[PDB]
Design a protein around this nucleic acid. Structure first.
Ligand SMILES: [Mg+2]
Ligand SMILES: [Mg+2]
Ligand SMILES: [Mg+2]
Ligand SMILES: [Mg+2]
Ligand SMILES: [Mg+2]
Ligand SMILES: [Mg+2]
Ligand SMILES: [Mg+2]
Ligand SMILES: [Mg+2]
Ligand SMILES: [Mg+2]
Ligand SMILES: [Mg+2]
Ligand SMILES: [Mg+2]
Ligand SMILES: [Mg+2]
Ligand SMILES: [Mg+2]
Ligand SMILES: [Mg+2]
Ligand SMILES: [Mg+2]
Ligand SMILES: [Mg+2]
Ligand SMILES: [Mg+2]
Ligand SMILES: [Mg+2]
Ligand SMILES: [Mg+2]
Ligand SMILES: [Mg+2]
Ligand SMILES: [Mg+2]
Ligand SMILES: [Mg+2]
Ligand SMILES: [Mg+2]
Ligand SMILES: [Mg+2]
Ligand SMILES: [Mg+2]
Ligand SMILES: [Mg+2]
Ligand SMILES: [Mg+2]
Ligand SMILES: [Mg+2]
Ligand SMILES: [Mg+2]
Ligand SMILES: [Mg+2]
Ligand SMILES: [Mg+2]
Ligand SMILES: [Mg+2]
Ligand SMILES: [Mg+2]
Ligand SMILES: [Mg+2]
Ligand SMILES: [Mg+2]
Ligand SMILES: [Mg+2]
Ligand SMILES: [Mg+2]
Ligand SMILES: [Mg+2]
Ligand SMILES: [Mg+2]
Ligand SMILES: [Zn+2]
Lengths: 122, 59, 51, 135, 158, 50, 86, 134
RNA sequence: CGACUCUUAGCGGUGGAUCACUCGGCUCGUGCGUCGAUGAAGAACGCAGCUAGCUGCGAGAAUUAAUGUGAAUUGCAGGACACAUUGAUCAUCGACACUUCGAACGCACUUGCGGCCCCGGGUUCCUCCCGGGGCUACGCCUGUCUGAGCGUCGCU
RNA sequence: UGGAGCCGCCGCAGGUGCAGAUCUUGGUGGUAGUAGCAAAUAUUCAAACGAGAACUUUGAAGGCCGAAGUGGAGAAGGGUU
RNA sequence: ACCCACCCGACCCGUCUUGAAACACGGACCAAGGAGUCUAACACGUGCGCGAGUCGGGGGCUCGCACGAAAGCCGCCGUGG
RNA sequence: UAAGGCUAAAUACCGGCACGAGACCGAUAGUCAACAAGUACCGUAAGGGAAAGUUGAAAAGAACUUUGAAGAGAGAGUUCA
RNA sequence: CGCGACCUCAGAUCAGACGUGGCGACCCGCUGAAUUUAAGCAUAUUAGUCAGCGGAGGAGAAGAAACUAACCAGGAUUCCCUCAGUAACGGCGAGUGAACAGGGAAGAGCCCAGCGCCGAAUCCCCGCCCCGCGGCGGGGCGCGGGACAUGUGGCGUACGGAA
């Protein structure tokens, strides 16, 4: 009876879709049965069918999105979805390399006049 | 029916039609004082309405 | 208000005087007994123990 | 100059503030330019400006703005300070050279006001009551 | 109103002081915080004097303080030059350098020099690698001390 | 008004859904504090957020 | 006739619902609010009425980005990774 | 005393933390002790009580020696219902009287893989305490 | 004695003082010190088997996944599951998802009109028609293309 | 009576003692079973239902509004009436 | 100390006021709340410590503060007042 | 050595996230807000803006008889009450 | 009557970027009252304070002297104590009111333009390959484009620098 993300992951895309439609369909059958009295036993299902749907749905979207950023991995210009969202400001920080660029000048000083480790009283 | 209020008549006529292997004459919306778009859906003469009803679950 | 004057301050020399007085009447068993400390079978009232 | 913008004369109140004509704005005209340029080009970042001329009714200025996310600024270390988000709108906070003047800060006796960061801070530090723990 | 004999007195509570009263319930915390950070600066700069850099003897100004002597901002350029120290190196062995200091009197000049002479002596310059080159001091004065100096280095006694 | 806008009609239709009284099976709930709905409205007295 | 009689002819309205701030205060002749200043870009506020101010600050509403930011921050702002699966 | 400066001692803050505690934390709170027979064997003081651990009530009216099976734990209400610990209503229908885990004692655990491992953890960390003290 | 009135006490009411509680405040202190066109704050409308409000969430709508936890949730139902199994429920939260307004962005605020590319029915590119998808804000920077000028010159 | 905490002494601290402020909030009397339930002619008889009818409904009689209406329909406004 | 009796005495308090039982104002009743505070600055008095001194701040040294955001200590002990 | 520029650190912090503490307040107090509160409600709108905590250890929340159209009671019962 | 350079200037749903609103305890920049006090009131005061507008960050602002001083001299800013309720201002009334020196917390210093030398020795962007890739970076290779002499890059900046 139970659908569990576990197994879905591997399955082929067309299969998953069928499984979703099959649920969607059931869910209409229930909601009609909710209207007509139907039975209590059915109006549990209505909740279960929902998440079972949402589950399929999610897993679909996941697989799809993995496969997107498998594709775009390496590409310079990637879509905004797949771009990393830290925080407005935090994407306008300097570029990890850029903030530790020295000027030729500043290196010359770091070569010639470095901090020595030292003590006093001997 | 009670329908998603975002629906046209065109969407309902082609939604119904898909689900119930049925052919509609004319959809005919209204909005309930509630948030529900209730569509009245005339079926084309060759199909019955009582028959389909039993098929779907109501009666 | 917060800026009520909560803290108070005391001359160093007095504080010391105080602490002396106090140490002095830690001896004097009468006082110690009057402060309640049940000190009946204690042996010698500046009561010092091996280290 | 800056006339005082009030309906008819009509600076209601005591007869001191009654002036509406002969009175003069705090920042300078160059520091209005540098602001208006910045204000328009909000992505850009104002470095500094310079006088190019003046008619009767106009002065003219050339404000030097930088795109803080154009690699040739970004990457060159000497520049990149502008990129950093503090220097967002220097001209608005009064930190261009032309801006800075009006705050009225230097070293030495002819200043004293501004002797925190700035005119407000000095005044702040001077009219905080410090009420100590022990008094 | 005043009432029979006692200081006329102008107290300054006319502006909105209550808006800007500053209370010192911090202070203890702040003594603690600063101290922690202090201790952590020491543990960072392992054997270097916690105090910081060697600072020079200096007279105070003005006929008042005149006779007293303080620490300076840093050793002036004449004073390095004479002690035989390159100005950009002095910063790297724990020697405060200000350059704005004029040097008028020959006496102070030679005093500060005698400091720097003294200092370089009693300094235990570590090497760059553990593999020892010139300058960096002997493995003797290194094992026997990777030791700090707590308190201002060569304290300025008047 | 019988010349409603959709926006209004939607807003009215939420209000009418919110008017209904409390379901009695609430009151048996363990941490219950609510006897009656309080926020109820009556068109004749009290007249909407319009 | 200044009074009760005239409360008769309160047939028609000034204001209506704003679209930005939900208040019934959007003036139809003026085509603005008077609560947020709708068509005006910047949200109206005023440092006289503190009470007003507090009735809608960041914390007042759902915070449906801003709260989950605070979570994200707390732990580190980590991206595009998962915990070690079973 | 306590010394750790990220813990409370603060009537209100504790109480909120107890009363507004969530279920997986209330597992830990509604723990009960093991009878001395078990205590010996497993080298464990106490165990979060569960749906069908047999149990003796120790305090209250129902206080006895009658080893009932727990029926159900009502973590909302911090209370367990026990096989025969019950009282008739006015209309005859029986009702389980809520007993609070701490006034109970476990006489037979309901061992599964997970519970067994827990008792293996508690023994282990006990004996490390004993080895440290020695 | 009669009725009434007043006084006092007893018992009843009326009303909610008092006292005792306290998952709330108020104050001081510490540590972090993070929003937004990758659509913020705020607004709206929705979503539970029975749910009005509060809260929680977004058409995957009282929540999906993943990790940790290890038998509940519980007002009543009803169910699942083999709690010797990715496993109830909690917690965490890294993946996924996130309707409509809103700086709010196709133009308009009626939910009113649109343009241009791509798909499915509809054709058999026949444009229509319907449905879907993707674009269509302003300002500004670096480059690109296409251009303008009796602007300054070159060769013909 | 009530059902969980409280006090004496020596010191310290204070948001420490109320009849009034046309004081603030809440509650209660006398007034008082009082003033009142008097604008626009009008009610009556029977029957039903019903625990119960001056008033509900049905029938009859007598009446009124008297098509610039007490009739039928809309706008604005209401928001399920 | 509850009621009742009688003799004698007896005007309603609050308040401003030269003068209030007033034909001066406030007060139907009851409960709870409700007004000389705190900071700064001087002054004089008084108590204590030290005395041609005194002084503690501000800082620093001693601990993760349970009690400690205390307590103790400082050629800083005296920059300085 | 002006009319160009960059710079950590002690410092700030009645907004935020998260902690600790108090000679503070104890439901007319303490935040407007202990509770479905910026809620209900008011105002065209700006804006204004409340009241409101406590059965009991456990719902064991009074089965059943009886009077009454019922509300209400009379018995019976639960409870240490 | 063309074609070509540049210059100034347009248009693009052209390629990639970025600003837009919020919060606002603290910070910076403007703007700026009047109640109040002066026993009246007008300058003064309240106060550069409330309200108004702008712009920030975890801090901000400031800052490496066109400084103080006048000494036997000190040596960026900030902050605390003190200076000092002082010098000074003021219908010299009411009221206002700092600064250096001294002791402390902390402590950190620097880079251009210019003047000159170096075949522009510099930069941005495209395209192929290897690595790396959730803060788009490293190496190589392209007669691939542009920016740049109306001046990029190294050296160097007043503590002096170059050869
Ligand atoms: Mg250079
Ligand atoms: Mg004036
Ligand atoms: Mg000038
Ligand atoms: Mg130091
Ligand atoms: Mg009405
Ligand atoms: Mg009460
Ligand atoms: Mg009450
Ligand atoms: Mg009790
Ligand atoms: Mg008190
Ligand atoms: Mg009273
Ligand atoms: Mg009568
Ligand atoms: Mg007539
Ligand atoms: Mg009609
Ligand atoms: Mg009519
Ligand atoms: Mg008189
Ligand atoms: Mg009289
Ligand atoms: Mg009077
Ligand atoms: Mg009266
Ligand atoms: Mg009282
Ligand atoms: Mg004295
Ligand atoms: Mg700066
Ligand atoms: Mg209350
Ligand atoms: Mg109350
Ligand atoms: Mg209250
Ligand atoms: Mg009470
Ligand atoms: Mg209770
Ligand atoms: Mg009560
Ligand atoms: Mg009792
Ligand atoms: Mg006056
Ligand atoms: Mg006066
Ligand atoms: Mg006057
Ligand atoms: Mg002034
Ligand atoms: Mg302001
Ligand atoms: Mg902003
Ligand atoms: Mg700065
Ligand atoms: Mg400078
Ligand atoms: Mg003095
Ligand atoms: Mg002034
Ligand atoms: Mg050059
Ligand atoms: Zn608005």
């Amino acid at each position: 009876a139970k659908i569990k993300a576990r197994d879905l992951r591997g399955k082929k895309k067309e299969e998953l879709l069928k499984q979703l439609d099959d649920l969607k369909v059931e869910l209409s059958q229930l909601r009609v049965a909710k209207v007509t009295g139907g039975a209590a036993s059915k109006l549990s299902k209505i909740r279960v069918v929902r998440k079972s749907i949402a589950r399929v749905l999610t897993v679909i979207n996941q697989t799809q999105k993995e496969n997107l950023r498998k594709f775009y991995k390496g590409k310079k210009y990637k879509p905004l979805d797949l771009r990393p969202k830290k925080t407005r400001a935090m994407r306008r920080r300097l570029n990890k390399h850029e903030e530790s660029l020295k000027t030729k000048k500043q290196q010359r000083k770091e070569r010639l006049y470095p901090l020595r480790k030292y003590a006093v009283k001997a | 029916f009670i329908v998603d209020v975002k629906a046209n008549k065109h969407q309902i006529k082609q939604a119904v039609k898909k689900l119930y292997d049925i052919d509609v004459a004319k959809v005919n919306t209204l909005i309930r004082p509630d948030g529900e778009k209730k569509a009245y859906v005339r079926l084309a003469p060759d199909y019955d309405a009582l028959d389909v009803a039993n098929k779907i679950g109501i009666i | 208000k917060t800026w009520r004057r909560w803290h108070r301050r005391v001359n160093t020399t007095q504080k010391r005087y105080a602490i002396c007085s106090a140490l002095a009447a830690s001896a004097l068993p009468a006082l110690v007994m009057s402060k309640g400390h049940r000190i009946e079978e204690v042996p010698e009232l500046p009561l010092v123990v091996e280290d | 100059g800056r006339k005082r913008p009030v309906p008819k004369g009509a600076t209601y109140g005591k007869p001191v503030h009654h002036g509406v004509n002969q009175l003069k704005f705090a920042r300078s005209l160059q520091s209005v330019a540098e602001e208006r340029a910045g204000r328009h080009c909000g992505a850009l970042r104002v470095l500094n400006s310079y006088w190019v001329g003046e008619d009767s009714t106009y002065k003219f200025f050339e404000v030097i703005l930088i795109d803080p996310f154009h690699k040739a600024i970004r990457r060159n270390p000497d520049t990149q300070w502008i990129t950093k988000p503090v220097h967002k709108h220097r001209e608005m906070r009064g930190l261009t050279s032309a801006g800075r003047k009006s705050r009225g800060l230097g070293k030495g006796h002819k200043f004293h006001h501004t002797i925190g960061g700035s005119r407000r801070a000095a005044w702040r530090r001077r009219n905080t009551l410090q009420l100590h723990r022990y008094r | 109103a005043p009432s029979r004999n006692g200081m006329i007195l102008k107290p300054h509570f006319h502006k909105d002081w209550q808006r800007r009263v500053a209370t010192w319930f911090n202070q203890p915390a702040r003594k603690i915080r600063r101290r922690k950070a202090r201790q952590a600066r020491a543990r960072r700069i392992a054997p270097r004097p916690a105090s910081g850099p060697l600072r020079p003897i200096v007279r105070c100004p003005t006929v008042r303080y005149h006779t007293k002597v303080r620490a300076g901002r840093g050793f002036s350029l004449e004073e390095l030059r004479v002690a035989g120290i390159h100005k950009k190196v002095a910063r790297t062995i724990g020697i405060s350098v200000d350059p704005r200091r004029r040097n008028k009197s020959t006496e102070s000049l030679q005093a500060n020099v005698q400091r720097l002479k003294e200092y370089r002596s009693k300094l235990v310059l570590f090497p760059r690698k553990p593999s020892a080159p010139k300058k960096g001091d002997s493995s003797a004065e290194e094992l026997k001390l990777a030791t700090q100096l707590t308190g201002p280095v060569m304290p300025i006694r008047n | 008004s019988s010349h409603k806008t959709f926006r209004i009609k939607r807003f009215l239709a939420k209000k009418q859904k919110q008017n209904r009284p409390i379901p009695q099976w609430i009151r048996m709930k363990t941490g219950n504090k609510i006897r009656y709905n309080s926020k109820r409205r009556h068109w004749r007295r009290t007249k909407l957020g319009l | 006739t200044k009074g009760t009689s005239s409360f008769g002819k309160r047939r028609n309205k000034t204001h209506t619902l704003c679209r930005r701030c939900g208040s019934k205060a959007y003036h139809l002749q003026k085509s603005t609010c008077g609560k947020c200043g709708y068509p005006a870009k910047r949200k109206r506020k005023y440092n006289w009425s503190a009470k007003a101010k507090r009735r809608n600050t960041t914390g007042t509403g759902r915070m449906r980005h801003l709260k989950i930011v605070y979570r994200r921050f707390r732990h580190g702002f980590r991206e595009g990774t998962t915990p070690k699966p079973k | 005393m306590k010394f750790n400066p990220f813990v409370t001692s603060d009537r209100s803050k504790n109480r909120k933390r107890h009363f507004n505690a969530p279920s997986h934390i209330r597992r830990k709170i509604m723990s009960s002790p093991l009878s001395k027979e078990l205590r010996q064997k497993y080298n464990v003081r106490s165990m979060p009580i569960r749906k069908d651990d047999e149990v003796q009530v120790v305090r209250g009216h129902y206080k006895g020696q009658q080893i009932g099976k727990v029926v159900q734990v009502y973590r909302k209400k911090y209370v367990i219902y026990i096989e025969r610990v019950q009282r008739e209503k006015a209309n005859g229908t029986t009702v389980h009287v809520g007993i609070h885990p701490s006034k109970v004692v476990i006489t037979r655990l309901k061992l599964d893989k997970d519970r067994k491992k827990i008792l293996e953890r508690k023994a282990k960390s006990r004996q490390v305490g004993k080895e440290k003290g020695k």
